[model samples]
Target chain A: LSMADKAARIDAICEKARILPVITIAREEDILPLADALAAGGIRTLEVTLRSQHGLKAIQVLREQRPELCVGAGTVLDRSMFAAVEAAGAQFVVTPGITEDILEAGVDSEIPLLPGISTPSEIMMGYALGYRRFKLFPAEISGGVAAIKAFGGPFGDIRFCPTGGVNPANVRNYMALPNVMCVGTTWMLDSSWIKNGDWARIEACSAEAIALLDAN
Target chain B: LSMADKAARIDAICEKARILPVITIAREEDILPLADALAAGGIRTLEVTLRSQHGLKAIQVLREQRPELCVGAGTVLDRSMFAAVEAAGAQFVVTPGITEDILEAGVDSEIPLLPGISTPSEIMMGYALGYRRFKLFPAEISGGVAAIKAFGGPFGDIRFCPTGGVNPANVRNYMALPNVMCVGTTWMLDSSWIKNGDWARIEACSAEAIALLDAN
Candidate 1:
């Protein structure tokens, strides 16, 4: 798909859901069940981060099994991962931070790449390169919502999907910002629940997360 | 001049004075007296910061009237400022922070630029682009001299011109570090002395600053 078309589609999907759960499934078998639980709770967007051993495979399995799920690849760092994630049928890709080579490669691939940015210069550089959407990585360490509010003064039109350090207590504050389209958090899917193969617990957490969005 | 040649000249000038005075003259008339007093007290290098209204013009007057002074421009933000300050006869240029365009423009300009930087990514970016010398701006606020010392772990060859909130009392502490090329501060020519036209007091403060280098 063309970059513009891909961005438009991602935006539409993102608007339907206010949270993108960043999950790292260690087993391929868990992908379907996990995705089913999340979707049952009214959460549609799932980003399987490459921080796990089975990230790419899980993305592929989920894409093939649950075509309705809006799957994306997270923690994507380089050109190889971009190709890997795209080939696995990820609808979009997200990175933890910006790098020149990675950005160039992502742009060249024509994928809907949400490159990470933490400072004004990084945001401007990404904007200069034709990117309007960004992922604010390690957000809390870089001043959290206050920092994002500061960026809103100069870049009010730009949208952000803040990841890292987002928790149940602070996610609302982040979502309250007009510029923030959605927030990426792993709080809905605890590792213990996933490790124990507790689909019910995952479903409960996902329902609570969706409920919080409704409250927001 | 070529970028390499300009960098070499900046290195030579910084080597001559251990404490590079970061001056902010509010009026054109104060430039000569300030430069003369600083020179008389055995200090030759001065960084006339663009924080005040008369910064560029002060660089011009000091370069013309006090030929013995090695003058630089500080707080430079963009290509235009870089060109303006260099045209005004500054020996080097400094900035409060680093950005891609700022770094690129500074390196391509005739005058040497010592862009301010903090954090590993910023330092690595500068290092990758052949900037061996840098400025640690808002130094104390951004973790102080100890931050520079800690930077030695990954960037051993990198040196710094520690500025912002630096004073005579702590100037020596910054200079004592092996990686510090020089310490930049405005305490030697405080606003009180400049406003009162107390050239003698300015000269005395400058002498004390120069004395710290002797101890070094």
Candidate 2:
């Protein structure tokens, strides 16, 4: 399938998973339990970030163990990361920002890339490249909901998955926007909870995250 | 001169002029007086934004009238805008974000481009292209001082001119950062003051802006 086709599939996945848990696996063993816990709590998608060393291994393992989850890689910075994630079986890809090499790689790769952007020109960069979907990263720091609202004016047909600085209190505000398909956040998977292997709390939080979206 | 040489000159210009007034010219006729007023108020540099139609003409007019001022263009989105601003004799160029076309254009052009960026990946994109100077646009919204501090970890040699949402209240906080060579702000050019043709007020505000940095 083409990049556009992959983007369409990514859009559907994001819409299905209202709150994508941006996971950072400190330990490889924790991947399965973490994925299972969130899945049991109504989570449909996961973005296991390459922030940690075990990220690739975790994505490789999760896709094999938990085939039901729509697992992808986040923080894929360059062409090499994109290649590694695709080989590791990431269903989709996410970037913190766009680069010429990354954009070119995304076009050639089978996996769709949700290139991160914070400005009109950045959007136009990808818009010209046939990318209609984007990740409005560091969301709160990059003008948050207001920034996304402003983007809607010039880029009406585009869709965004706003990530960063998203928590329970303001997740609803982001979800309320028509342009936002889903929000990638770490709120549901607290670091302290992850450190202590408190999968139950993670599960409950994950369920609460879904409920919050459902409440809207 | 090469892009790198132009960048070095941009760095020197930014250092000499710590406060860059980002002006959106409403009336073409007001350009000369406004440039003169700011120059009289200790302002050595100006960023005439293309947010309005009069931007290119204003830059041309200002460069000729106020040869003492380091005049540049802001809100330059594409290659065409970059070309137009360069033709108008803008000393430097600034973009809201990075794109392959713009990056390529900046490299080939005679003027330096301080591309706007809000993420580490975005910085890496430009970094690979031999750019060390950047504009941390919508400064306050895109993590403000904290973000620049974070960028220092990975990109120690890089310099930034933060613009957007910068006002008198928090200009000091941004100026205090070691990585920041200068800052771009519209706070000094109040719309009401401009509408009333209050050059004195603008001059005074411009002086105060210089004082804010001097107080540091």
Candidate 3:
């Protein structure tokens, strides 16, 4: 698909998920099972961070096991690593912030790149490059809901998936912002649950988190 | 001046002031009095934003009236504005966030550009471009003290002038950080006082703000 087509597709994917499950796959073997649990609990999208050694393998394994879900890569720091995740079958790529090389990679890549942005000038940089979707990384520290409100005044065309410091208690606060389509958080399916192979608890947390949005 | 020399000059300027007064000159006529007030109160550094139509004129007026004091431009959104301020004799330029084009312009300009940043990745972009001095715009909203501390963990060489939402009550908190040389605040010199041309009160506020640092 073309870059525009890819961005459009992820737009729908993100809106549907609303709670983008950010996963850290410590054990490669649990990748499929964890994906199964979250998807079974109604999360249609997942972002696996490259911080883990098994990140690429997890993406590959999750994509292989759950073709129905949109599995992407996160903590992608550079262009070459972006290429690695794409090769591993990631449907989308998420970055911590906009970098020169990575911006170039995202524009030309087949799949979408949810480039993280913290300030207006960075949005202008990506906007000039035709990016309409973004991930507001370290979202809380980078100006949680207030910053997003200020940004909406000038650049209303953009949408965000605010990650970092997001929890069930505060997830609704981010959801209320017109600019935020979804939020990436690990609270629902913390690594300990995955490490201990507690798929049932992960499933429960995912369902409860999703219920917050549905009831509201 | 070369980039390194430009960077070094702002380093000393930031440390010398430690409480950079960010101004929005509503009336061009008030420029000289404001400069005098700030300088008399022992704060030698100033940043006038382009939000006001009189921003350039204010910079020119301040530079001409207070030749001994170091005056710079703030909320400089683009390269051409940077050039205009340079031509107007602005000693330095500050941006709200990093942009590729602006970064290039600042790197080559004779005066320093303290590019505003909110994320570590944004810092990495400026660091790669050889910028060691930055203004953390909307500082309070973007994780204020915590964010600066986080950036210092990996990038120790960088120093900051934290602006946006900084008041007399919290200015000292920002000043206490190892990475922060100064903070940009209007608490000491609000626009109403400037509009009324209350130079004595402003001078008093500036002295009180400077005393916060001194007493500490």
Candidate 4:
């Protein structure tokens, strides 16, 4: 597909829910249960970050065993990571920021790259390259709702999925913006719950957050 | 000079004052008086934004008439603007953000370009290119003091002059961070003060803000 087609695909996937759980897998044993817990709670899409060694395997397992969920790779910083994620069957790709090589590789990749941006110019660089979807990373710190609202003025057609510092209470404010297609956060997947192997609490957290937004 | 050489020049200029007044020239006549006012108020460095048509001319007038002040251009978006500012005799340059071309142009430019950035990847791109000094734009909104402090963990060697949403009260918090070299703000150059040619008030605001930080 062309870049715009890829972007449309991303838009369609993101539209499935208002919250895309940003999960970091600490143990290989936790992947399936975590996915199942999030899924049982009504999450249709989620991201596994490359910040961990298990990220590639996690995405591969999710793609093969959990075909019902839309799995993407996050924290993809370079060309090799992009290639690796695609090979692992990431339905979409995300980055914390953009560089020339990353942007170029994303354009020709099999999946869409929802490049992260916190400033107008960063988004403009991606926008110039035919990317219409972006992740407003560290959203709360990077002006949160007000900044995204300001972006709508110059980039009216652009869609954003604000991640980083997103929480249950503030996700509504992020969702309220016309440009915010969805949000990516790890709040529902609390570290303590993961540490204790408490899948039930994880499931409840996801359900409550999704239900709170009427996104489920 | 090498990129490092230029970066050093920017640091030297930024260190002379903690508060770098971001100026927007509404009238060419206000240029020298405003420069003189800021200088008299003990501000040694300032940024004249290209948001106004008179920006280039303002920098030239300041360079010639107000030789004692370290004058730089802000809001430079592309290669052409970088060239124009250098040609106009600007001592330094700043961008609201960085693009590949902008970063490349900056590396070779006569004056250093203190490119603005809000995320780790954005800074990483410039870091790969040997840029160590940056403008943490929309500072307050992009995580304020905390975000920049977090940046210290990974980018301890980098220096920042935060702009956007910075004010008298919060400038201290930004300044308190070890990575922060200075701050860029327009609070001192009040619009009403400019409209009424209240140079004294402008100078007072500049002095007070500068003094509050013990920057002068």
TM-scores of chain A in all candidate models: 0.93, 0.97, 0.94, 0.97
lDDT value for candidate 4?
A: 0.85
Error of 1 at B37 (Å): 27
lDDT of 2 by residue, B147-173 (tens): 787566335678999988888888899
Tens digit of per-residue lDDT, candidate 3, span A1-216: 566776688798899888888787777678778888888888879999999899999888878778888888999998889999999999998888887789889878988889998787778688767788888878887778887775663356678999989997788989988778899988987767777889999898888888888544
Ranking of all candidate structures by their DockQ, best first: 3, 4, 2, 1
Q: Could you tell me which residue pairs clash in candidate 1?
A: none
Q: What is the DockQ of each candidate?
A: 0.07, 0.22, 0.25, 0.24
Question: Regarding lDDT, does 2 or 3 come out ahead?
Answer: 2
Off by over 4 Å in 1: A1-15, A118-128, A146-158, A214-216, B2-102, B111-116, B124-149, B152-216
Task: Write down the TM-score for model 3.
Answer: 0.63
Can you list the residue pairs that collide in candidate 4?
Answer: A141-B142, A141-B143, A142-B142, A143-B141
Docking class of 2: incorrect
> Each candidate's chain B TM-score?
0.93, 0.96, 0.94, 0.96
Estimate the Cα RMSD of every predicted model relative to the unseen true structure.
7.9, 6.8, 6.6, 6.5
* Residue B195 shift from truth in candidate 2, angstroms: 27
Clashing pairs in 3: none
Using all chains and alpha carbons, the TM-scores for the candidates as numbered come to 0.61, 0.62, 0.63, 0.63
> Between 1 and 3, whose TM-score is larger?
3
lDDT of 1 at B151: 90
Candidate 1 C-alpha lDDT tens digits along A1-216: 565665566677667778889888787778888999899988888989999889988988888888888899988888888899988898888888887877777667755888888765577566656677888887887667876775563355578888889988988898888888888888888888888988899898888877886655
Rank by lDDT (best first): 2, 4, 3, 1
Per-residue lDDT over A93-127 for candidate 2, one digit per residue giving the tens place of the 0 to 100 score:
98777877888888998878888887787789888
